[PDB]
Scaffold this active site. Sequence first.
Site, PDB file in Angstrom:
ATOM      1  CE1 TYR A  97      -3.545   2.684   0.235  1.00  0.00           C
ATOM      2  CE2 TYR A  97      -2.579   3.038   2.542  1.00  0.00           C
ATOM      3  CZ  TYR A  97      -3.301   3.455   1.310  1.00  0.00           C
ATOM      4  OH  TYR A  97      -4.355   4.737   1.407  1.00  0.00           O
ATOM      5  N   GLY A 113       9.422  11.721  -8.831  1.00  0.00           N
ATOM      6  CA  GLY A 113       8.287  11.179  -8.520  1.00  0.00           C
ATOM      7  C   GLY A 113       8.504   9.516  -9.058  1.00  0.00           C
ATOM      8  CG  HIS A 138      -7.049   5.102  -1.415  1.00  0.00           C
ATOM      9  ND1 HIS A 138      -6.472   4.576  -0.343  1.00  0.00           N
ATOM     10  CD2 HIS A 138      -7.990   4.270  -1.814  1.00  0.00           C
ATOM     11  CE1 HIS A 138      -7.046   3.250  -0.140  1.00  0.00           C
ATOM     12  NE2 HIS A 138      -8.061   2.931  -1.067  1.00  0.00           N
TER      13      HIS A 138
HETATM   14  C1  LIG Z   1      -0.805   8.400  -2.026  1.00  0.00           C
HETATM   15  C2  LIG Z   1      -0.745   9.020  -3.434  1.00  0.00           C
HETATM   16  O1  LIG Z   1      -0.389   8.518  -4.174  1.00  0.00           O
HETATM   17  S1  LIG Z   1      -1.135  10.800  -3.057  1.00  0.00           S
HETATM   18  C3  LIG Z   1      -0.972  11.400  -4.933  1.00  0.00           C
HETATM   19  C4  LIG Z   1       0.369  11.584  -5.462  1.00  0.00           C
HETATM   20  N1  LIG Z   1       0.804  12.786  -4.788  1.00  0.00           N
HETATM   21  C5  LIG Z   1       0.407  14.213  -5.198  1.00  0.00           C
HETATM   22  O2  LIG Z   1      -0.640  14.188  -5.882  1.00  0.00           O
HETATM   23  C6  LIG Z   1       1.245  15.274  -4.423  1.00  0.00           C
HETATM   24  C7  LIG Z   1       1.488  16.445  -5.248  1.00  0.00           C
HETATM   25  N2  LIG Z   1       2.035  16.066  -6.800  1.00  0.00           N
HETATM   26  C8  LIG Z   1       3.362  15.567  -6.447  1.00  0.00           C
HETATM   27  O3  LIG Z   1       4.068  15.210  -5.549  1.00  0.00           O
HETATM   28  C9  LIG Z   1       4.038  15.083  -7.752  1.00  0.00           C
HETATM   29  O4  LIG Z   1       3.080  15.940  -8.827  1.00  0.00           O
HETATM   30  C10 LIG Z   1       3.862  13.560  -8.353  1.00  0.00           C
HETATM   31  C11 LIG Z   1       4.487  12.895  -7.010  1.00  0.00           C
HETATM   32  C12 LIG Z   1       2.449  13.452  -8.572  1.00  0.00           C
HETATM   33  C13 LIG Z   1       4.682  13.448  -9.268  1.00  0.00           C
HETATM   34  O5  LIG Z   1       6.236  13.754  -9.150  1.00  0.00           O
HETATM   35  P1  LIG Z   1       7.197  14.293  -9.901  1.00  0.00           P
HETATM   36  O6  LIG Z   1       8.423  14.274  -9.405  1.00  0.00           O
HETATM   37  O7  LIG Z   1       6.660  15.434 -10.789  1.00  0.00           O
HETATM   38  O8  LIG Z   1       7.123  12.970 -11.235  1.00  0.00           O
HETATM   39  P2  LIG Z   1       7.821  12.820 -12.460  1.00  0.00           P
HETATM   40  O9  LIG Z   1       8.596  13.860 -12.737  1.00  0.00           O
HETATM   41  O10 LIG Z   1       8.506  11.334 -12.210  1.00  0.00           O
HETATM   42  O11 LIG Z   1       6.667  12.687 -13.628  1.00  0.00           O
HETATM   43  C14 LIG Z   1       5.859  13.397 -13.934  1.00  0.00           C
HETATM   44  C15 LIG Z   1       5.543  14.002 -15.151  1.00  0.00           C
HETATM   45  O12 LIG Z   1       6.970  14.561 -15.635  1.00  0.00           O
HETATM   46  C16 LIG Z   1       7.395  14.433 -16.736  1.00  0.00           C
HETATM   47  N3  LIG Z   1       8.742  13.957 -16.681  1.00  0.00           N
HETATM   48  C17 LIG Z   1       9.187  12.850 -16.361  1.00  0.00           C
HETATM   49  N4  LIG Z   1      10.615  13.003 -16.437  1.00  0.00           N
HETATM   50  C18 LIG Z   1      10.689  14.159 -16.954  1.00  0.00           C
HETATM   51  C19 LIG Z   1      11.885  14.627 -16.889  1.00  0.00           C
HETATM   52  N5  LIG Z   1      13.146  14.023 -17.012  1.00  0.00           N
HETATM   53  N6  LIG Z   1      11.967  15.888 -17.434  1.00  0.00           N
HETATM   54  C20 LIG Z   1      10.658  16.704 -17.809  1.00  0.00           C
HETATM   55  N7  LIG Z   1       9.661  16.008 -17.609  1.00  0.00           N
HETATM   56  C21 LIG Z   1       9.538  14.699 -17.022  1.00  0.00           C
HETATM   57  C22 LIG Z   1       6.386  13.154 -17.292  1.00  0.00           C
HETATM   58  O13 LIG Z   1       5.788  14.314 -18.508  1.00  0.00           O
HETATM   59  C23 LIG Z   1       5.574  12.864 -16.240  1.00  0.00           C
HETATM   60  O14 LIG Z   1       4.283  12.939 -16.779  1.00  0.00           O
HETATM   61  P3  LIG Z   1       3.094  11.928 -16.645  1.00  0.00           P
HETATM   62  O15 LIG Z   1       2.605  12.298 -15.315  1.00  0.00           O
HETATM   63  O16 LIG Z   1       2.030  12.709 -17.716  1.00  0.00           O
HETATM   64  O17 LIG Z   1       3.477  10.781 -16.890  1.00  0.00           O
END
Ligand SMILES: CC(=O)SCCNC(=O)CCNC(=O)[C@H](O)C(C)(C)COP(=O)(O)OP(=O)(O)OC[C@H]1O[C@@H](n2cnc3c(N)ncnc32)[C@H](O)[C@@H]1OP(=O)(O)O
Length: 211
Positions: A97, A113, A138
Amino acid sequence: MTEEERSSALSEVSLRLLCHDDIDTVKHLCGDWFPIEYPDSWYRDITSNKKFFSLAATYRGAIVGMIVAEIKNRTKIHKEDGDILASNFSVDTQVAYILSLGVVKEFRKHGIGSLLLESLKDHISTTAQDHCKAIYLHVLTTNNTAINFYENRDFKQHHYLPYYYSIRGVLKDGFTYVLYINGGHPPWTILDYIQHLGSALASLSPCSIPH
Ligand SMILES: CC(=O)SCCNC(=O)CCNC(=O)[C@H](O)C(C)(C)COP(=O)(O)OP(=O)(O)OC[C@H]1O[C@@H](n2cnc3c(N)ncnc32)[C@H](O)[C@@H]1OP(=O)(O)O
């Protein structure tokens, strides 16, 4: 930027487990990451209890992202998601989980992420490959950024959960997302499964089947 500066940069980002000293920092970050509110008990548990895999990405020593998960027996799944796995998997079967995933906004869309999620998968493979058959979590139904991130990493929407969350006292809907691993699959009645089976076996030529 010196070559020396370039070399230093290579050791700047790293991964480590959370510890009890992290609690105040983790609270500040979570307050920013999520519009919901976690109780003090949650912060204490995720930082200090070894049953959790609590992993931080750090930059220059500071936490910039985390994933927190629990590998646990299938029986520990809460009732709203009790149907994630078939009940005829072994009594030793486990699930993972994801309690939380977050990255500081400043550092988003750089793959952090993704690497955190991949690290959890690597940890599961290392630690529990024999028994862990699903990963679940979730999200708020309104969280398109999270939904896209998970869907693009092959998680599938499993349940709709009305009024699952509270944002500042106002109830909000959620979804469960699931990724099956190591042969995990949802429950089927035998009768339903045999109906489905006809589509799965359709590919076999009648000639290959004893008759
Ligand atoms: C229990 C839960 O899961 S709660 C829900 C998740 N958490 C949240 O929503 C909290 C707020 N949001 C966040 O913290 C962030 O937006 C997260 C955790 C959702 C994603 O974290 P990030 O570090 O941005 O992820 P990451 O960079 O790997 O990928 C995101 C996007 O970036 C892009 N990406 C990945 N690598 C790169 C890169 N190297 N250079 C530019 N863009 C990139 C992709 O387009 C990816 O897109 P997709 O989501 O459409 O596939």
